[PDB]
Amino acid sequence: SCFCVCITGPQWDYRYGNKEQCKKFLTECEQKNPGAEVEIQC
């Protein structure tokens, strides 16, 4: 099970899911938020 993160200033988003869902989360993070701080760990 993976943990992934998309931080945009004071809005902090997190997901717990499988690797496919966390890869999707980071792709969406990047499309919406080019400057986000990110993490994936599985």
PDB file of C-alpha atoms in Angstrom:
ATOM      1  CA  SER A   1       0.000   0.000   0.000  1.00  0.00           C
ATOM      2  CA  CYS A   2       1.319   3.419  -0.976  1.00  0.00           C
ATOM      3  CA  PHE A   3       1.231   6.901   0.521  1.00  0.00           C
ATOM      4  CA  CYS A   4       1.426   9.971  -1.682  1.00  0.00           C
ATOM      5  CA  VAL A   5       1.375  13.704  -1.096  1.00  0.00           C
ATOM      6  CA  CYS A   6       0.620  16.900  -3.042  1.00  0.00           C
ATOM      7  CA  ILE A   7       1.332  20.101  -1.055  1.00  0.00           C
ATOM      8  CA  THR A   8       0.338  23.493  -2.481  1.00  0.00           C
ATOM      9  CA  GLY A   9       1.007  26.129   0.113  1.00  0.00           C
ATOM     10  CA  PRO A  10      -1.626  25.846   2.862  1.00  0.00           C
ATOM     11  CA  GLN A  11      -3.623  23.173   1.013  1.00  0.00           C
ATOM     12  CA  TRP A  12      -2.227  19.721   1.772  1.00  0.00           C
ATOM     13  CA  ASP A  13      -3.517  16.669  -0.111  1.00  0.00           C
ATOM     14  CA  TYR A  14      -2.779  13.026   0.708  1.00  0.00           C
ATOM     15  CA  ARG A  15      -3.737   9.639  -0.675  1.00  0.00           C
ATOM     16  CA  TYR A  16      -3.416   6.088   0.610  1.00  0.00           C
ATOM     17  CA  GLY A  17      -3.958   3.611  -2.201  1.00  0.00           C
ATOM     18  CA  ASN A  18      -2.213   1.197  -4.530  1.00  0.00           C
ATOM     19  CA  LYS A  19       0.689   2.245  -6.718  1.00  0.00           C
ATOM     20  CA  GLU A  20      -1.581   2.876  -9.706  1.00  0.00           C
ATOM     21  CA  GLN A  21      -3.738   5.223  -7.647  1.00  0.00           C
ATOM     22  CA  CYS A  22      -0.717   7.050  -6.232  1.00  0.00           C
ATOM     23  CA  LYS A  23       0.834   7.390  -9.685  1.00  0.00           C
ATOM     24  CA  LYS A  24      -2.461   8.883 -10.866  1.00  0.00           C
ATOM     25  CA  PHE A  25      -2.499  11.194  -7.841  1.00  0.00           C
ATOM     26  CA  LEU A  26       0.919  12.584  -8.693  1.00  0.00           C
ATOM     27  CA  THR A  27       0.062  12.982 -12.381  1.00  0.00           C
ATOM     28  CA  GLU A  28      -3.026  14.974 -11.401  1.00  0.00           C
ATOM     29  CA  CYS A  29      -0.969  16.934  -8.880  1.00  0.00           C
ATOM     30  CA  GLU A  30       1.519  17.883 -11.592  1.00  0.00           C
ATOM     31  CA  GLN A  31      -1.135  18.880 -14.126  1.00  0.00           C
ATOM     32  CA  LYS A  32      -2.986  21.080 -11.633  1.00  0.00           C
ATOM     33  CA  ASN A  33      -0.073  22.213  -9.482  1.00  0.00           C
ATOM     34  CA  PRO A  34       3.283  22.575 -11.305  1.00  0.00           C
ATOM     35  CA  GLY A  35       4.952  23.868  -8.156  1.00  0.00           C
ATOM     36  CA  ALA A  36       3.677  21.299  -5.659  1.00  0.00           C
ATOM     37  CA  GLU A  37       5.809  19.492  -3.130  1.00  0.00           C
ATOM     38  CA  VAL A  38       5.271  15.780  -3.654  1.00  0.00           C
ATOM     39  CA  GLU A  39       5.989  12.350  -2.206  1.00  0.00           C
ATOM     40  CA  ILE A  40       5.340   8.707  -3.071  1.00  0.00           C
ATOM     41  CA  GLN A  41       6.335   5.846  -0.817  1.00  0.00           C
ATOM     42  CA  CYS A  42       5.153   2.243  -1.138  1.00  0.00           C
TER      43      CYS A  42
END
